[PDB]
RNA sequence: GCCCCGGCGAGGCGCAGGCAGCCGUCGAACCGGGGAUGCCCGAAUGGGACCUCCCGCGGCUUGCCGCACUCCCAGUCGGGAGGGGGAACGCGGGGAAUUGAAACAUCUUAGUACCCGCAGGAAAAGAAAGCAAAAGCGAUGCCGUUAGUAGGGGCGACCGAAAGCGGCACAGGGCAAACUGAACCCCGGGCCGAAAGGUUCGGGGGAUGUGGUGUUGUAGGGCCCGCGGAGGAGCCCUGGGGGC
RNA sequence: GAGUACCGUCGGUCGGAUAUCCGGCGGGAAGCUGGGAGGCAUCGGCUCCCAACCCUAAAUACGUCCCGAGACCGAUAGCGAA
């Protein structure tokens, strides 16, 4: 999940991926109350990447 | 009724003054502006002077009546600056004009001179 | 022409047609606000010597101030007898300068150039003030006045840079007697004026 | 508020479990700035259900808590199981 | 050399300044006219 | 904590010596540079604040833009400005008492502490209606002397300069008026051109004077009358070199 | 280049003393054959200047920051705060 791949795609796919990632994050934070404690961090930063690059595109 | 106004002037004589100004603009010579009119009266190249009645402040034209009485030159009044400037051929008003070398306007000039002389006296 | 005659009419208003004009004008002015904008100057030659052009960016204002001096408030703590006085004090700024500062308070985007006296009553004096808009291109394009769009020229009237402030600071003198006024009053421990 | 940006967490406590079993209700920790209509749309869109009632409170930890009742056609147990619980 | 200094006004825009007298201009035409009329006697 | 261009060259995940795990050879962490995101209050500004939270009106398409006060240019379309903050230094106003005089009232403390207003990276000043004295100098500012001197003062306690001389550093320019009389300035659009510039189409100003000229001591300038030419000086960077 | 220069009176300030500067009040010019200064006021000479409009770099003052240094202190010391 890197800009190399992200910048190869279109905008609709990016928004869809953001959506599914946010749902994943909510579910993982739900279970965290009750392995691999870095899933949340990596999800957050993937979301940030996607938004940054989508904005680069929609600005140019 | 500002105080530099020394006598009343009928609409007829005012119209005649404006028409003389327009005719002499076309053909003869015209000095537009209070500074130029004052220079003309001080030198002695002016036949008829036209003042406006709606000038504020008064300090701008209040010297012309006495200066013209001294230099024995005739002057008349008109009620608006916009019309005076429009007949002088300008896109701006004018508080005073002087006609010089009237061409095809001597008729009106002489008539206005006599009328305004008997009006002052 | 047309300026010498105004000068001569205004050099003494009692000996001219100006006294009566002024009495009537003041009857009306007494009814107007303390700071009022006007369309044209009253003393055109006076305006044109101090700096005034028929251009966009020049504003003329008339200001009314009360005559006389000042009265100090009543000291509440104890004072020695040389520090008790209340009634016989005079301002160190001139009424002209005070009037310019009033106009500047009312017009917060302009700068004062100069001012001139235009009338006197038993209770009131009148001054006309020339202002300039330093953000207008017609002004930025005129070298006679383009300096005023600099960074060290805002607050002129408040720091003392108009002719009235120069005069009340004491900078029209030179040589014997002017030892304590330059380069500033603060530079000499306030001992000038 | 925009959907997918409203819900922070599901809640699984003894009280929430009792409610899922006895009243067809889910319980969520939600953003402070979201309203009942936004919460309704969020739950609907993110889980493809129909919502009958939303109740809200602010806790003494600064988090907004929402009790969402589902219509009887649906079953909150399936949504809870499909979630991490 | 009478090369201009470039300064900025109250706003963000740029003015030309003479290095011999301190005058301030907005246009090269005016700067040139001034530099030639006021200091041409320097040859 | 997200992205990109360069550097360095294998480890990295703050003060902070832990557990479980992730990122990195597609060149990370780190360093220089440039971008994105940037909740509420606050000059706080669509309107209200006994609680950093609330309540709206228009226009478009649920998401977005506009909607404060005092003004300028305009004009019922729009385009602009100001407010607040900043250690010390800066400019302009208002202004005590302790204390000393072995008491104290003129005086001193002191144009001091404090108060109000206004600016900047420096501010203020600045180009003789001057200083001098049988000789002359040549804007302003700063340093060393002049000097505890001239002089002020219950002539008490105390207060207190300047010119000149030696140095640092150097620079001079523009208006108003007289004479001309629209030959003028800005704003927006379109054409040429790398830019500077040029050329057009409208609108706003201006005869209550835009523009040109001119700026000084027995003077300078204008007006009037004659001779005349080649040398000056700036703005911009398609391009080519060089140094930081 | 006019309520200006100047005259008188009051208040403040100054080393400025009958000869400092600012302000208020009452009077108030000439304006190129013109005007001002030269430490009480006036007269005559001699010398020096041309106010009442505007702008201006460098040499200076400071250090909330940065760089460098020290016959400075060495944890009750040194900035209140290692
Ligand atoms: Zn110059």
């Amino acid at each position: 999940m890197k800009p190399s791949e992200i910048r190869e795609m279109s905008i609709e796919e990016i928004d869809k991926k953001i959506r599914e990632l946010r749902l994943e994050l909510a579910k993982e934070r739900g279970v965290l109350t009750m392995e691999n404690p870095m899933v949340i961090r990596n999800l957050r930063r993937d979301i940030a990447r996607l938004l940054t690059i989508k904005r680069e595109k929609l600005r140019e | 009724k500002p105080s530099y106004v020394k006598f009343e002037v009928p609409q007829e004589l005012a119209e005649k003054a404006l028409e003389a100004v327009e005719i002499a603009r076309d053909t003869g010579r015209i000095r537009k502006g209070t500074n130029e009119t004052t220079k003309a009266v001080e030198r002695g190249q002016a036949k008829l002077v036209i003042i406006a009645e709606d000038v504020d402040p008064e300090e701008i034209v209040a010297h012309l009546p006495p200066l013209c009485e001294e230099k024995e030159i005739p002057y008349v009044y008109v009620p608006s600056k916009k019309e005076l400037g429009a007949a002088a051929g300008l896109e701006v008003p004018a508080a005073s004009v002087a006609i010089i070398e009237p061409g095809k306007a001597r008729e009106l000039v002489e008539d206005i001179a006599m009328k305004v002389k008997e009006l002052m006296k | 022409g047309m300026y010498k005659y105004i000068r001569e009419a205004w050099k003494s208003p009692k000996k001219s047609y100006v006294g009566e004009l002024l009495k009537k004008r003041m009857i009306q002015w007494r009814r107007d606000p303390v700071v009022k904008r006007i369309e044209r100057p009253t003393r055109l030659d006076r305006a044109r010597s101090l700096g005034y052009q028929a251009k966009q960016g020049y504003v003329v204002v008339r200001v009314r101030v009360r005559r006389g001096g000042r009265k100090r408030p009543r000291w509440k703590g104890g004072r020695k007898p040389s520090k008790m006085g209340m009634v016989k004090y005079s301002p160190k700024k001139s009424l002209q300068w005070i009037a310019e500062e009033k106009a500047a308070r009312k017009f917060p985007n302009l700068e004062v150039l100069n001012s001139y006296w235009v009338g006197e009553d038993g209770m009131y004096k009148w001054f006309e003030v020339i202002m300039v808009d330093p953000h207008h291109p017609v002004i930025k394009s005129d070298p006679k006045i383009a300096w005023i769009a600099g960074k060290a020229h805002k607050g002129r009237v408040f720091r003392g840079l108009t002719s009235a402030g120069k005069r009340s600071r004491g900078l029209l003198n030179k040589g014997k007697g002017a030892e304590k006024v330059r380069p500033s009053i603060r530079a000499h421990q306030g001992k000038g004026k | 508020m925009d959907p997918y940006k409203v819900i922070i967490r599901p809640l699984v406590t003894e009280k929430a479990v009792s409610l899922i079993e006895r009243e067809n209700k889910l319980t969520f920790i939600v953003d402070r700035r979201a309203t009942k209509q936004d919460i309704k749309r969020a739950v609907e869109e993110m889980f493809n259900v129909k919502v009958a009632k939303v109740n809200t409170l602010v806790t003494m930890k600064g988090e907004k808590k929402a009790y969402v009742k589902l219509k009887p056609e649906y079953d909150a147990s399936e949504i809870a199981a499909r979630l991490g619980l | 050399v009478l090369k201009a200094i470039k300064i900025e006004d109250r706003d963000g825009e740029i003015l030309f300044r003479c290095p011999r007298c301190g005058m301030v201009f907005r246009s090269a035409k005016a700067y040139t006219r001034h530099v030639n009329k006021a200091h041409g006697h320097l040859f």
Side-chain angles (χ1 to χ4, degrees), chain E residues 18 20-23 34 38-39:
Chain E
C18 182
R20 175 69 181 196
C21 75
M23 284 178 77
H34 161 76
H39 316 295

mmCIF file of all heavy atoms in Angstrom, chain E residues 18 20-23 34 38-39, chain F residues 173, ligand 1:
data_model
loop_
_atom_site.group_PDB
_atom_site.id
_atom_site.type_symbol
_atom_site.label_atom_id
_atom_site.label_comp_id
_atom_site.label_asym_id
_atom_site.label_seq_id
_atom_site.Cartn_x
_atom_site.Cartn_y
_atom_site.Cartn_z
ATOM 1 N N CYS E 18 15.993 56.066 -6.005
ATOM 2 C CA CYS E 18 17.246 56.636 -6.469
ATOM 3 C C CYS E 18 18.322 56.509 -5.392
ATOM 4 O O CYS E 18 18.050 56.748 -4.212
ATOM 5 C CB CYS E 18 17.057 58.101 -6.833
ATOM 6 S SG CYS E 18 18.527 58.911 -7.481
ATOM 7 N N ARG E 20 21.034 58.435 -5.233
ATOM 8 C CA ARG E 20 21.712 59.716 -5.112
ATOM 9 C C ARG E 20 20.917 60.743 -4.319
ATOM 10 O O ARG E 20 21.515 61.634 -3.712
ATOM 11 C CB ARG E 20 22.012 60.257 -6.513
ATOM 12 C CG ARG E 20 22.604 61.643 -6.582
ATOM 13 C CD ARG E 20 24.015 61.703 -6.057
ATOM 14 N NE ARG E 20 24.531 63.064 -6.119
ATOM 15 C CZ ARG E 20 25.813 63.391 -6.013
ATOM 16 N NH1 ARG E 20 26.735 62.457 -5.835
ATOM 17 N NH2 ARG E 20 26.170 64.661 -6.087
ATOM 18 N N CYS E 21 19.591 60.629 -4.294
ATOM 19 C CA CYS E 21 18.737 61.590 -3.608
ATOM 20 C C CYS E 21 17.675 60.953 -2.730
ATOM 21 O O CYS E 21 17.218 61.608 -1.787
ATOM 22 C CB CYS E 21 18.047 62.522 -4.619
ATOM 23 S SG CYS E 21 16.681 61.801 -5.539
ATOM 24 N N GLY E 22 17.281 59.710 -2.984
ATOM 25 C CA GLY E 22 16.304 59.029 -2.167
ATOM 26 C C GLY E 22 14.880 59.063 -2.668
ATOM 27 O O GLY E 22 13.983 58.611 -1.948
ATOM 28 N N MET E 23 14.636 59.574 -3.870
ATOM 29 C CA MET E 23 13.276 59.643 -4.374
ATOM 30 C C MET E 23 12.761 58.257 -4.747
ATOM 31 O O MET E 23 13.527 57.324 -5.007
ATOM 32 C CB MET E 23 13.192 60.578 -5.577
ATOM 33 C CG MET E 23 13.234 62.025 -5.205
ATOM 34 S SD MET E 23 13.201 63.134 -6.619
ATOM 35 C CE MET E 23 11.472 63.056 -7.038
ATOM 36 N N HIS E 34 13.753 61.343 -14.253
ATOM 37 C CA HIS E 34 14.342 61.975 -13.077
ATOM 38 C C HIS E 34 15.860 61.863 -13.091
ATOM 39 O O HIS E 34 16.570 62.852 -12.883
ATOM 40 C CB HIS E 34 13.781 61.346 -11.804
ATOM 41 C CG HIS E 34 14.616 61.599 -10.589
ATOM 42 N ND1 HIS E 34 14.633 62.812 -9.940
ATOM 43 C CD2 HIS E 34 15.474 60.800 -9.914
ATOM 44 C CE1 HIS E 34 15.463 62.749 -8.916
ATOM 45 N NE2 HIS E 34 15.987 61.539 -8.878
ATOM 46 N N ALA E 38 17.755 65.477 -13.152
ATOM 47 C CA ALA E 38 18.245 65.955 -11.869
ATOM 48 C C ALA E 38 19.742 65.762 -11.679
ATOM 49 O O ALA E 38 20.378 66.581 -11.008
ATOM 50 C CB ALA E 38 17.501 65.249 -10.735
ATOM 51 N N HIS E 39 20.323 64.702 -12.242
ATOM 52 C CA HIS E 39 21.725 64.376 -12.020
ATOM 53 C C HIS E 39 22.529 64.277 -13.310
ATOM 54 O O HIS E 39 23.662 63.787 -13.283
ATOM 55 C CB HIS E 39 21.846 63.066 -11.237
ATOM 56 C CG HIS E 39 20.903 62.960 -10.078
ATOM 57 N ND1 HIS E 39 20.972 63.794 -8.984
ATOM 58 C CD2 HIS E 39 19.877 62.113 -9.840
ATOM 59 C CE1 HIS E 39 20.025 63.467 -8.125
ATOM 60 N NE2 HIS E 39 19.346 62.449 -8.621
ATOM 61 P P G F 173 22.010 67.124 -6.912
ATOM 62 O OP1 G F 173 22.317 66.360 -8.146
ATOM 63 O OP2 G F 173 22.142 68.600 -6.912
ATOM 64 O "O5'" G F 173 20.533 66.755 -6.451
ATOM 65 C "C5'" G F 173 19.405 67.474 -6.922
ATOM 66 C "C4'" G F 173 18.128 66.805 -6.491
ATOM 67 O "O4'" G F 173 18.099 66.676 -5.043
ATOM 68 C "C3'" G F 173 16.832 67.529 -6.806
ATOM 69 O "O3'" G F 173 16.422 67.419 -8.155
ATOM 70 C "C2'" G F 173 15.870 66.891 -5.817
ATOM 71 O "O2'" G F 173 15.472 65.601 -6.248
ATOM 72 C "C1'" G F 173 16.763 66.743 -4.590
ATOM 73 N N9 G F 173 16.603 67.888 -3.674
ATOM 74 C C8 G F 173 17.461 68.916 -3.398
ATOM 75 N N7 G F 173 16.976 69.772 -2.541
ATOM 76 C C5 G F 173 15.715 69.281 -2.239
ATOM 77 C C6 G F 173 14.698 69.764 -1.375
ATOM 78 O O6 G F 173 14.695 70.768 -0.660
ATOM 79 N N1 G F 173 13.584 68.940 -1.385
ATOM 80 C C2 G F 173 13.456 67.800 -2.125
ATOM 81 N N2 G F 173 12.314 67.120 -2.022
ATOM 82 N N3 G F 173 14.386 67.338 -2.932
ATOM 83 C C4 G F 173 15.477 68.122 -2.936
HETATM 84 ZN ZN1 LIG H 1 17.706 61.613 -7.488
#
